[PDB]
Amino acid sequence: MTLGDLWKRRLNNCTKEEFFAYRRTGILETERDKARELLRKGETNMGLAVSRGTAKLAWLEERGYVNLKGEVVDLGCGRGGWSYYAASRPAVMGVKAYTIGGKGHEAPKMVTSLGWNLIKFRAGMDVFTMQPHRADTVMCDIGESSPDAAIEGERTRKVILLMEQWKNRNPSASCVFKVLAPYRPEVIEALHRFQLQWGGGLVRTPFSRNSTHEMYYSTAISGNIVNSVNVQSRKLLARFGDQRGPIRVPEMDLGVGTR
Ligand SMILES: C[n+]1cn([C@@H]2O[C@H](COP(=O)(O)OP(=O)(O)OP(=O)(O)O)[C@@H](O)[C@H]2O)c2nc(N)[nH]c(=O)c21
Numbered sequence: 604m605t606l607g608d609l610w611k612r613r614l615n616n617c618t619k620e621e622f623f624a625y626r627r628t629g630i631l632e633t634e635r636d637k638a639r640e641l642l643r644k645g646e647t648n649m650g651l652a653v654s655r656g657t658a659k660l661a662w663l664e665e666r667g668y669v670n671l672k673g674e675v676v677d678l679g680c681g682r683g684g685w686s687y688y689a690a691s692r693p694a695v696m697g698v699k700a701y702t703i704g705g706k707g708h709e710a711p712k713m714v715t716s717l718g719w720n721l722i723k724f725r726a727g728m729d730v731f732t733m734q735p736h737r738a739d740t741v742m743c744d745i746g747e748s749s750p751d752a753a754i755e756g757e758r759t760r761k762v763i764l765l766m767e768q769w770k771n772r773n774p775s776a777s778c779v780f781k782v783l784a785p786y787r788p789e790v791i792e793a794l795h796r797f798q799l800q801w802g803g804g805l806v807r808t809p810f811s812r813n814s815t816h817e818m819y820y821s822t823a824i825s826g827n828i829v830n831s832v833n834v835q836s837r838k839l840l841a842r843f844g845d846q847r848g849p850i851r852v853p854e855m856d857l858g859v860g861t862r
């Protein structure tokens with residue numbers, strides 16, 4: 604059993620109040636008041652982020668932890684917060700975005716955020732059985748939470764296998780993908796094998812809530828996985844008891860228009 608497994612147990616053992624206060628203590632949280640209502644009313648001419656994924660992928664780019672270029676695939680695009688961010692990057696030529704949609708899943712949000720004409724959205728798509736095709740940048744933000752860490756580790760393994768298939772088709776593509784439960788042993792093994800052939804490493808964004816152990820893997824960074832994971836588990840285990848609120852920060856406004 605790992606520090607991550609123990610973190611999960613403590614998380615599930617929180618009362619409702621302990622949980623609500625732990626989830627958000629000390630985290631970065633974008634201020635989405637205007638964005639949410641603009642989405643709610645059906646306004647399409649808006650550059651504000653369609654979801655909280657935009658600021659996470661933006662944080663990765665700006666830090667230099669991902670280099671988004673060329674033909675991008677967004678696997679599991681959901682509302683499209685990553686697809687929109689990518690399409691607004693001048694170095695990006697196109698975005699092929701896929702997501703399952705359907706009952707209990709987010710369809711793409713359709714707006715005119717900068718670069719939108721360059722995204723091809725395909726909802727109703729299961730990326731786990733789709734044959735890969737050419738891409739320069741492979742992104743994947745899939746990983747649905749579950750109180751059951753074993754299920755979370757299996758969902759995570761399926762994401763890493765998916766990336767191995769796209770790397771097989773595109774050996775040179777840069778990848779960035781969520782690793783939902785990076786402490787699970789089948790996940791640590793999978794990520795070691797990925798790292799040994801493709802390079803890369805793990806990093807925590809400051810926007811991820813404490814209720815999730817997610818970390819993002821990218822071929823543009825480096826560092827020991829086991830160490831990356833155990834450092835994060837300890838930070839997470841030490842935040843239990845913190846009373847501080849989230850740090851609220853502005854939401855992205857990527858602007859509108861075609862490219
Ligand atoms: C609602 N809830 C969730 N958790 C734990 O928190 C983890 C994350 O669950 P979450 O509800 O905090 O976020 P989720 O990823 O489902 O939402 P999204 O990002 O908008 O898609 C769960 O897998 C549980 O382990 C919870 N843990 C406790 N103790 N009490 C709770 O009420 C509770």
Ligand SMILES: Nc1ncnc2c1ncn2[C@@H]1O[C@H](CSCC[C@H](N)C(=O)O)[C@@H](O)[C@H]1O
Pocket residue numbers: 653654655656657678679680681682683684685686701702703704708709728729730731744745746
């Ligand atoms: N097998 C599958 N095939 C396709 N999409 C899937 C999938 N499993 C989960 N997904 C989608 O993966 C999405 C992850 S949400 C990702 C957030 C996104 N980066 C944003 O910035 O808005 C979910 O909407 C879910 O519907």
Ligand SMILES: [Mg+2]
Pocket residue numbers: none
């Ligand atoms: Mg929930």
